[PDB]
Amino acid sequence: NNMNVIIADDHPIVLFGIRKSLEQIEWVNVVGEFEDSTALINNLPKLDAHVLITDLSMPGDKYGDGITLIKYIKRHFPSLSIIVLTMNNNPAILSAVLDLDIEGIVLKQGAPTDLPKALAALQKGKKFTPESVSRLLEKISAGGYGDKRLSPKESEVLRLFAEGFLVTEIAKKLNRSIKTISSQKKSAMMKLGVENDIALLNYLSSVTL
Amino acid sequence: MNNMNVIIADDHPIVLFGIRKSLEQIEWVNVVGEFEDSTALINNLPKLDAHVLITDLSMPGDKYGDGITLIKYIKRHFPSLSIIVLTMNNNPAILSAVLDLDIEGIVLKQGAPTDLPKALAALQKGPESVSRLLEKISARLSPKESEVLRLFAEGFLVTEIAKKLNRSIKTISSQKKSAMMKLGVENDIALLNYLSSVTL
Numbered sequence: 115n116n117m118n119v120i121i122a123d124d125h126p127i128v129l130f131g132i133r134k135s136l137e138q139i140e141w142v143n144v145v146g147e148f149e150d151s152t153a154l155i156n157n158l159p160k161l162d163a164h165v166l167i168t169d170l171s172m173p174g175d176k177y178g179d180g181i182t183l184i185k186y187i188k189r190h191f192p193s194l195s196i197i198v199l200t201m202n203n204n205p206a207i208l209s210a211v212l213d214l215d216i217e218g219i220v221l222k223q224g225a226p227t228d229l230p231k232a233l234a235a236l237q238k239g240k241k242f243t244p245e246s247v248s249r250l251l252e253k254i255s256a257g258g259y260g261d262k263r264l265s266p267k268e269s270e271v272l273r274l275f276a277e278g279f280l281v282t283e284i285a286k287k288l289n290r291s292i293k294t295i296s297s298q299k300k301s302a303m304m305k306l307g308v309e310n311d312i313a314l315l316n317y318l319s320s321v322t323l
Numbered sequence: 324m325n326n327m328n329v330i331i332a333d334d335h336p337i338v339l340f341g342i343r344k345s346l347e348q349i350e351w352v353n354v355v356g357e358f359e360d361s362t363a364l365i366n367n368l369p370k371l372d373a374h375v376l377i378t379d380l381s382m383p384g385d386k387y388g389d390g391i392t393l394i395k396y397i398k399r400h401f402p403s404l405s406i407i408v409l410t411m412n413n414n415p416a417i418l419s420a421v422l423d424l425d426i427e428g429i430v431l432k433q434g435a436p437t438d439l440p441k442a443l444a445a446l447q448k449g450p451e452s453v454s455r456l457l458e459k460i461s462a463r464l465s466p467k468e469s470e471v472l473r474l475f476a477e478g479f480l481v482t483e484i485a486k487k488l489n490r491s492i493k494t495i496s497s498q499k500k501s502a503m504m505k506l507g508v509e510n511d512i513a514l515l516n517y518l519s520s521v522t523l
């Protein structure tokens with residue numbers, strides 16, 4: 115069973131690496147390489163791909179990147195198997211990708227064999243989870259907020275935080291007190307499992323909802 | 324041409340794989356070692372007759388650091404070594420600080436796949452990559468402040484930022500508060516939003 119593979123990453127050095135690590139796998143065929151999400155979504159309908167190995171952070175205004183792009187691929191190419199290869203190791207981001215029920219997550223900070231092992235497992239209709247992914251996924255699992263989703267109010271505050279506004283600007287913009295905005299903000303944070311402001315913005319750069 | 328022994332360092336093994344692939348074409352290149360943190364790199368440099376280092380900017384290593392600290396350490400202890408920095412960092416202040424250290428090349432991970440071969444060829448001729456990027460920046464902060472800001476913005480807590488510089492919690496906190504006021508932000512959140520809009 116040959117597997118036709120599409121690779122997507124905004125760093126061409128990584129694309130070369132992915133091919134370099136896949137050259138030893140005889141049953142893998144690379145039918146396309148893309149560096150932004152517009153080019154990827156445009157070429158998906160014309161290649162007959164079985165698997166996508168995709169990055170999370172990439173350019174592309176039309177279809178975006180991150181969780182948004184992956185959801186989009188799931189809806190419109192449901193038979194396509196997805197493995198995410200990402201440097202974005204924020205537990206909240208990775209738990210969000212795991213929620214999408216794709217065929218694997220691999221970290222660029224992980225082991226050199228993690229990607230070929232993910233593909234090997236997929237050939238056997240199985241899921242490979244590296245330890246490096248498992249560890250920080252258990253942090254969010256254990257804490258116990260994985261089930262909960264954002265309210266419209268919470269989403270509203272965070273969407274403006276995602277365009278770089280401060281708590282005092284959002285209060286004025288939504289016509290709410292600082293106390294209310296902060297309470298809404300911290301409640302949203304507890305749900306997403308992000309413990310500080312840098313973690314929150316990094317989460318917000320990978321989801322646009 | 325003259326044969327070059329090359330050492331590669333990056334905390335992402337996929338990138339290390341990619342660099343080998345980019346250089347496998349070049350007859351005169353020989354890769355003599357691959358390292359994923361600055362401690363393994365520095366420990367091994369004297370044992371391998373390295374001529375060129377292709378190094379990442381952000382990598383683990385508390386002992387010799389990363390970034391500017393590492394490059395300075397390498398310049399001082401290995402003056403016969405040529406250094407090419409290969410990085411995803413696209414902050415003008417950081418890059419200008421790296422380019423102040425007189426390295427022999429810079430390649431951005433966003434740039435073309437041929438840039439690395441091309442930077443190697445320029446090392447024989449005695450760099451275009453530094454110039455082009457300097458002009459890209461042309462068309463405020465200190466190197467010590469820049470590095471504190473990098474570490475913070477990359478995801479590292481203030482605690483973690485102490486050990487990579489052997490500066491205390493107070494000294495990194497003070498340079499941060501200085502750099503924040505020096506840039507025009509008064510807030511951690513405003514600090515990341517600034518970094519976005521200054522990006523190359």
Ligand code: BEF
Pocket residue numbers: 169170171172199200201202222
């Ligand atoms: F930019 Be990818 F998510 F490593």
Ligand code: BEF
Pocket residue numbers: 379380381382409410411412432
């Ligand atoms: F982590 Be490197 F600076 F791309």
Ligand SMILES: [Mg+2]
Pocket residue numbers: 123124125169170171172
């Ligand atoms: Mg990327």
Ligand SMILES: [Mg+2]
Pocket residue numbers: 333334335379380381382
């Ligand atoms: Mg790195």
